[PDB]
């Protein structure tokens, strides 16, 4: 295979990594192993550190103006780079030793064991005026030759590489999702029953979502209008719970459920960023620097944790609202998993040279 590098501005340090993204199987995490080519000839600090952080950016403006990074350090970890710590002995991976033989002794390895239950690499839809580094959630590895950790990071003597970690749809389908409601009004005895069903718990980004919806209206009034909305519950946990809401797809049906009538219809909705660029700040999946990614993937968390993770939790739902002739509005809901197909390769995003 091939391996990526990034050369530090000073040329003394260089970093070599194998794959940009890391599969988050939740139960286990891909060990993030890389190497650093070091130049002791121009090195003078006599010590080098490499550290990996996961950080979520502070939201847009700070002190009534945007810019700069008050991002909270969700998790930071450090490791010695050169000279290697003799006390630190760990089993090198095959890629590590391959890079070592390709480069030599000036390449020094490092491994990071990302704990589970950490936020997925999620980005926030920037505004058209946002010229700084993108706001959202991401990991960043970085190297720098310094004697100790305290020292101010000197941009002439360091290097950084931003990275993302991804989850994927289970190959095992869950039970076929169902929901039902029975709304009754004070004006009538017989109930208004409504039911919605989705074919599968899982969908892939860019493929349709088909819902079978049935209605039974026996009340005196009549159902007049139908709102269908593929929506997204995104939970923000910078300080505490913050369930910020924005739907992604909608359609209006002028269909009618008559009194004492049954309605059986299939509705087809398929999200796409095109009609959602205007919805500023809409959650999206991870980005390298600014390349237009896809929509945010369904965050999957281990059930053992109590869902307190200090990060954005992304879950996609579909909302069906019926309106009755002139409280009358009725809503029913069905959640659905939303992740990519089975991975096989890297993310080769496509752009002009």
């Amino acid at each position: 295979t091939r391996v990526f590098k990034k050369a530090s501005p000073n040329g003394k340090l260089t970093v070599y990594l194998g794959k940009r993204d890391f599969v988050d199987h939740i139960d286990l995490v891909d060990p993030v192993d890389g190497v650093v080519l070091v130049d002791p000839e121009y090195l003078k600090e006599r010590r080098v550190y490499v550290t990996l952080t996961c950080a979520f950016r502070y939201g847009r403006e700070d002190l009534d103006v945007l810019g700069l990074t008050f991002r909270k350090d969700l998790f930071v970890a450090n490791v010695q780079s050169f000279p290697p710590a003799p006390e630190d002995k760990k089993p090198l991976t095959r890629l590590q030793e391959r890079l070592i033989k390709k480069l030599g002794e000036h390449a020094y390895p490092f491994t990071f064991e990302i704990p589970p239950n950490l936020p997925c690499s999620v980005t926030l839809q920037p505004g058209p005026e946002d010229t700084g580094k993108a706001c959202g959630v991401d990991y960043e590895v970085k190297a720098f030759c310094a004697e100790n950790l305290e020292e101010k990071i000197h941009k002439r003597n360091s290097v950084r590489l931003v990275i993302r970690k991804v989850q994927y749809a289970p190959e095992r389908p869950g039970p076929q999702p169902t929901a039902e409601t029975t709304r009754q009004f004070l004006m009538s005895d017989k109930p208004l029953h409504l039911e919605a069903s989705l074919d599968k718990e899982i969908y892939y980004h860019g493929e349709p979502i088909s819902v079978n919806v049935h209605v039974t209206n026996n009340t005196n009034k009549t159902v007049k209008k139908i709102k269908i909305s593929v929506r997204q519950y995104a939970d923000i946990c910078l300080f505490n719970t913050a369930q910020y809401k924005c739907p992604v797809a909608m359609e209006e049906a002028d269909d009618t459920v008559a009194p004492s009538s049954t309605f059986c219809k299939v509705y087809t909705l398929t999200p796409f960023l095109a009609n959602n660029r205007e919805k500023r700040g809409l959650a999206l999946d991870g980005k390298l620097k600014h390349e237009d990614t896809n929509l945010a993937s369904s965050t999957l968390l281990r059930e053992g944790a109590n869902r307190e993770i200090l990060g954005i939790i992304v879950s996609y739902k579909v909302k069906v609202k019926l309106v009755v002739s002139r409280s009358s509005d009725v809503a029913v809901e069905l959640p659905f998993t939303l992740m990519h197909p089975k991975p096989k390769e890297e993310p080769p995003h496509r752009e002009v040279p």
Partner: single-chain antibody, 227 residues
């Protein structure tokens, strides 16, 4: 200048069950986003390799490929009678993407397309590709053209989910591309046609979630722009 590929082993014949070697040379650093297409003579292209290391589904394992820098090696352990056809190498990391002149070996899903035919120069003409069996939002849609004695060139691309349009340099603002999501069809209009537009046009369906080599093609339609 734009990135070029070059196909050296243009000529080869009278090979049965033997090692067949093909090289494609990349004019610039292109990493691994390279693919090889099989088109039977008078038929549609068929996907052989992508990334020069990933065999496509439904391909015999006897075909193989590899990358050596910007050079790319196609290997056949034992040639077969059905493999005497046209072979193409193409990078897919920078738009515009272009095919090299096909490598022909000589011996002694629904994608319907319509609209083409004969036309005078300096006009507009209509084509369309109705796609069935898959989902339009899950893929990008592309237009390639077959000019005999000329290297194959991609000319058009539409990204429904991203909602972007891409064209070759020689065709910028010269043709209109579109696609009805509902009808699941790609529409095409040729504004101000000239002699260079004479070719056989083929319909290619991407697979959006991550771009790779084109999987399925339409049989194409002839377009002869002449007085």
């Amino acid at each position: 200048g734009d990135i070029q590929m070059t196909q050296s082993p243009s000529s080869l014949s009278a090979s049965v069950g033997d090692r067949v070697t093909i090289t494609c040379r990349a004019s610039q650093s292109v990493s691994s986003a390279v693919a090889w297409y099989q088109q039977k003579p008078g038929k549609a292209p068929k996907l052989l390799i992508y990334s020069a290391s990933s065999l496509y589904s439904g391909v015999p394992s006897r075909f193989s490929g590899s990358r050596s820098g910007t050079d790319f090696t196609l290997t056949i352990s034992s040639l077969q009678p059905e493999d005497f056809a046209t072979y193409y190498c193409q990078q897919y990391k920078y738009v515009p993407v272009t095919f090299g002149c096909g490598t022909k070996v000589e011996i002694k899903v629904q994608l319907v397309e319509s609209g083409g035919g004969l036309v005078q120069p300096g006009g507009s003409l209509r084509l369309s590709c109705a796609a069935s069996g898959f989902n339009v939002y899950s893929s990008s849609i592309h237009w390639v053209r077959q000019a005999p004695g000329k290297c194959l060139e991609w000319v058009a691309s539409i990204s429904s989910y991203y909602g972007y349009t891409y064209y070759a340099d020689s065709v910028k603002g010269r043709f209109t591309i579109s696609a009805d999501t509902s009808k699941n069809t790609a529409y095409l209009q040729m504004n101000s046609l000239r002699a260079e537009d004479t070719a056989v046009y083929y319909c290619a369906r991407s697979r959006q979630f991550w771009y790779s080599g084109l999987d399925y093609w339409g049989q194409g339609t002839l377009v002869t722009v002449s007085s």
